[PDB]
């Protein structure tokens, strides 16, 4: 238990880029959630329609599905790793997906260390 909530989660946003965990967007998260391989989730509160957040919640409740809440998808552009970077490594197109699901587990010892502790406290 060394890393934080928004510190150990960049490892969750690391191997999904490597071994195909990213169910990012609006249609890739839920439509592949029902195929008994999806594991994690992060809800983002940014909405002009609260039904969007209300979509995610019952989707988290039909197969006892895990959930984290980090604030907004304008903030999550600085989290996920899907940005157009410039000549010096500075992102100019800062767009990240709100609801980021990670299906597969590349087996680690610092993301499952920190964040499974927060998972058992929540549920």
């Amino acid at each position: 238990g060394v890393m934080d909530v928004n510190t150990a989660l960049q490892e969750v946003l690391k191997t999904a880029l490597i071994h195909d965990g990213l169910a990012r967007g609006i249609r890739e998260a839920a439509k592949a959630l029902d195929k008994r391989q999806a594991h994690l989730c992060v809800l983002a509160s940014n909405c002009d329609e609260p039904m969007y957040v209300k979509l995610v919640e019952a989707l988290c409740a039909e197969h006892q599905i895990n959930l984290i809440k980090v604030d907004d998808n304008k903030k999550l552009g600085e989290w996920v790793g899907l940005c157009k970077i410039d000549r010096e490594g500075k992102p100019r197109k800062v767009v990240g997906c709100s609801c980021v699901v990670v299906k597969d587990y590349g087996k680690e010892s610092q993301a499952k260390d920190v964040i499974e502790e927060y998972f058992k406290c929540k549920k």
């Binding site: 029902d34 969007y52 019952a58």
Partner: protein
Amino acid sequence: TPKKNKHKRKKVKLAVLKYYKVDENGKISRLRRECPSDECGAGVFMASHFDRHYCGKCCLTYC
């Protein structure tokens, strides 16, 4: 015809809302028919048209 136009994609914004009718408990009334396919079953809906029911991925069709 001097100017042949092409196919603009229909700009329908935020339509996954219509796919899932979330009830007031935690249920979802799944208003669209699920495709029974082997390739694309259990995750991919079909299309409720005015008389028929049509999957788009493996091109499966019902009335």
